[PDB]
Design a protein around this ligand. Sequence first.
Ligand SMILES: *[C@@H]1O[C@H](CO)[C@@H](O[C@@H]2O[C@H](CO)[C@@H](O[C@@H]3O[C@H](CO)[C@@H](O)[C@H](O)[C@@H]3O)[C@H](O)[C@H]2NC(C)=O)[C@H](O)[C@H]1NC(C)=O
Ligand SMILES: *[C@@H]1O[C@H](CO)[C@@H](O)[C@H](O)[C@H]1NC(C)=O
Ligand SMILES: *[C@@H]1O[C@H](CO)[C@@H](O)[C@H](O)[C@H]1NC(C)=O
Lengths: 49, 49, 48, 447, 48, 100, 339, 50
Amino acid sequence: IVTIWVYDPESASTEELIWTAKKPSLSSRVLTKQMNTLGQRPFIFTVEK
Amino acid sequence: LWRYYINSQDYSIFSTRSSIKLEYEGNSFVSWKIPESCKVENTTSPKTT
Amino acid sequence: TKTMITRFFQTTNYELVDNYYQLQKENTGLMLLQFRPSEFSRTCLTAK
Amino acid sequence: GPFVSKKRFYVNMNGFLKRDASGKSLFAIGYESLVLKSSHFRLSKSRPLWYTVNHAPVFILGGFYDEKSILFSDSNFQDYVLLELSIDSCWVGSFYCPILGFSATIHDAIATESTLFIRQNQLVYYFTGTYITLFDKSHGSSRWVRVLPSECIKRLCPVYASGNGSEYVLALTTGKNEGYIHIGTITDGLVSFEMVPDGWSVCEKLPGKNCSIDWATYIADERNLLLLVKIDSGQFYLVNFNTEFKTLNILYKIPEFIPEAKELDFLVLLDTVTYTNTPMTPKGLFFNTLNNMLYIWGNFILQSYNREEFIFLADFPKESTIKYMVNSFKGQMAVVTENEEIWYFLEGGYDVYQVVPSQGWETYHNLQKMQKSSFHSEDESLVSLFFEDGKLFQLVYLFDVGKERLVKRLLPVGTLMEYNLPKPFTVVNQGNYQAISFTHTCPFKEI
Amino acid sequence: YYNENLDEKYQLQTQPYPLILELQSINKDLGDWCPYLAFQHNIHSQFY
Amino acid sequence: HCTWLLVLNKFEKVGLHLSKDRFQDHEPIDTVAKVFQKLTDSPIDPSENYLSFPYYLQINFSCPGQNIEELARKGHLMGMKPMVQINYMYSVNFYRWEME
Amino acid sequence: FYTSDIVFIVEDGRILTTKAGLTTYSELGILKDAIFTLYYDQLGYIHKLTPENFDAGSKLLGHGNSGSIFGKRPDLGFEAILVPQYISTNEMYFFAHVPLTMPTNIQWKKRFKTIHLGKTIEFSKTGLANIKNVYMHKTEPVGFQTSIHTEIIVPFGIENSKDSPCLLSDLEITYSGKLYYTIKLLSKNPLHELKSTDVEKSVLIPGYSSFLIMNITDKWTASALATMPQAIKSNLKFLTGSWFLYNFGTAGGRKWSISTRQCNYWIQQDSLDFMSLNLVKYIDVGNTIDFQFKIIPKAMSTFPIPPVSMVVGNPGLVEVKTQGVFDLNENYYLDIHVS
Amino acid sequence: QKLYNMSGDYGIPDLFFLDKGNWFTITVVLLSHQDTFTSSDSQGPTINVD
Ligand SMILES: *[C@@H]1O[C@H](CO)[C@@H](O[C@@H]2O[C@H](CO)[C@@H](O[C@@H]3O[C@H](CO)[C@@H](O)[C@H](O)[C@@H]3O)[C@H](O)[C@H]2NC(C)=O)[C@H](O)[C@H]1NC(C)=O
Ligand SMILES: *[C@@H]1O[C@H](CO)[C@@H](O)[C@H](O)[C@H]1NC(C)=O
Ligand SMILES: *[C@@H]1O[C@H](CO)[C@@H](O)[C@H](O)[C@H]1NC(C)=O
């Protein structure tokens, strides 16, 4: 089970940059729901198949 | 001996909205030398942005 | 601009032949291909 | 033959006319016994033009200096007329609401399809025209009918869209029923007003001792009602009221001071920002239901995609206050302040461009004045502006001697944006000489 | 970087290395360039 | 450059006046049957009934440097003819009329 | 009738040319002969006829050119001061300078006429533009009476720093007493100065009004006239590399010319029995005839306005129905049905 | 008469109508500038234009 959210490297927390975070920060959460309102959704595409 | 760091390991994000941390190690240090296009925070300190 | 299209195929017929399994074995196995430009140097970041 | 450019006219049905005993056409809403003077437009400021968007056949402009006259126009102000109204000018004011200075002017003229509303000195009148290709002959009105007789109305607000086959109008009151507003429904030539927030006033479910409503937009889709509420201290809240249900929820709390951004164009108003020292003054709001966009305007411009996160558009200066704004409902917006300076917003970006005080307008004005045009004079006063099929028109008054007249005139924003001359350039070297080559700003050559 | 005599939390510290930018700085000092504008293909796999 | 001018005329004042008449009649009138009784060699059956709208649209064009009448004369003499496209907008009440 | 050319011979020997239907004209050349006449043959070539002289032309092409007999195409420009100004990135104003205190009867030598409409203006340094409008304004701007609105093709050459040394300085333009403009050089270096040869030159800054340096009152101060002086209302200050000099003056030799442009349209017709330039078609009763043309523009094209104006001689016997559409590459397709 | 198929006006329409799974497509042809793309854009199987 993978959990995906969007983040901006300039205004993200220090934990989101060393890949140790477990919950999105305030900026990442607000940016993620703003991108969701415009209609953005991620999907995972396998490469070999 | 000096170097520079950026906030993203990916270099497809690197553009004009990025910040570059310049770090100098050494006994003798006067200042930084940048073109007129770029600006540096606290241009007399060895660790700057 | 130069555009190349290449097709890989085999052209064998297995009807009315002797040693069908031996002929089948003789036309099987692995092979490796690579695509690259003619001349290239540094500053060229293309993964071949 | 010769080439004549394609033109669009509006031939709409006037329903406010009648015929006398001699068979001569007259107006039912007023007498045409006034002649246009130059003292009408010398000192007055511009005013918005309010109507239901694609359905109103008649345009009415109010807000003159001290007369109960209106500018009436069938079509789309290709021709107009100046009607002195037949309002009785009676007075019923008493201690039940505060007494203010009398003013014979007409305020907040709204022209919904088949019915037009006016306000004059805390009174609201409506007239319903007789249309035979719309409804019955008996629904039309014979004079101006006074609505809300027991209430003192402080403002009238429009609803541009329409839902469930009906039109809506809003009335914000003062003196009595401070937390309540009135929603008026027009169906088939019949108007009916309703006291929307029910028994309880909206000040009870909101901080502060008592509350005052400043502006309201009614979304007929979803039956929502967004409203600006000022409290006793002076903070502003944007709140929401549902009509199908009877609930109320706080939507946003407007900051007291504007945020700061030295070089940023857009700022997401998070909970960690830095404020300046100058105060904020929210004046109004606008909802677009095609794109679900919310705008709050005043000393600033706030833009919201959902109703949870807001964006400050920092290109608008903090010393200018937006008098009003118009929308083409196709992606363009015109903002008019109190210094009669006009700004342009496009929904595809985050920049607000000044157009009227600018270099492109100077070049265009000079080029029209040297082509011997008849719409441009050295002395002019903007009366109003509106949108028509994506073209921004402005009705203006030409003060020049011999041609003192009111004319509607295009404002081509693309030509002004192309004529804005200070642009980046380089001293290129060509033909063993030098030249001024302008750098390309667009990312693509053609589309 | 590895170094003992520390507080056990910084005995192994990782720092990135922007090799592409250093290479481009060297090339700006030198002046080499890529002979082709682009080379595209459609091999999206490795084992056909 | 040169621009169109459109005005509204009554049915009984087509050529007598070039001024503006206002849109006040909203019903079609029946002053056209006598003209259709005389079309004996045209495919006009007597069973079908005709009656006219009130009002005409009257069009000319004006272009600076010349007067309107000689411009219209030249446009007629060179083969020009105006083409008019009318679009109708539906009402708010979709419970009483259709959206077409 | 072939090539639809018209030639008028006017005393002093000038020759005016046009095509049928066109509303403009050009000047083919001059001819000082005593007695001569001009003759167009069937193929379109032009001959000059004199006793013992039947001349056909020095240079002969495949088609029927109308300027074969004349050697070099004349320059259509006059001797005056042209002060330019940008109005957009690709559009330009040129103002013609009529001097003050000079006679009224000889005014016409220093004005833009209607002949220049549809021509091109060329600079000897570099650059080329196409005239698209001629405006006359005798009163509102002072010192300038006519101007041309042109579109830039090749963006013109600016003045060097060796020939004019005032460029390496900071400028300051102030409003003078009556109507002039004092141009002061902030940098007081005696190397730069203002040379006496830098008179009748145009100083411009893209975004503001342009000035024509008319008088020199000091070693670092000039007096100049302003094109469209109604949009300053302040005091100006510039930097070293922000303002530029142009030499369109007649002093030392005039370096700008006006001449006709090359062909910019192609007419494609894929259908046979219509390739002739002269056609006669019969129609009986009821029967109709249709033809279709394609127009390919070699340069910038009129996007909203169709590039073909068509007239009918007698419309009272014929019925003409035309359709015309544009394209993406701006090709124009039209078809005509005639009954 | 009543027109069903005509060679009238072209270009984009203002307003669209949909009914239960019907769709539409548009094509945007872009003409780029002279030197918009350099050789640093060819990193893999396709040049990135974003
Ligand atoms: C071209 O069409 C326009 C309008 O479509 C015509 O202009 C109109 O001309 C009439 C003249 O019969 C003008 O009427 C005058 O009105 C005044 C005041 O109402 C009245 O006192 C006069 O006695 C006369 O009735 C009318 O104002 C004018 N309209 C406009 C907008 O200018 C024009 O005549 C047409 N041209 C030709 C050659 O027919
Ligand atoms: C009620 O609120 C208004 C502002 O909305 C304020 O002016 C007034 O003082 C308040 N009343 C009391 C009793 O505080
Ligand atoms: C100004 O121009 C006039 C006219 O040519 C001339 O007589 C006068 O000497 C000039 N003065 C200066 C200071 O250049």
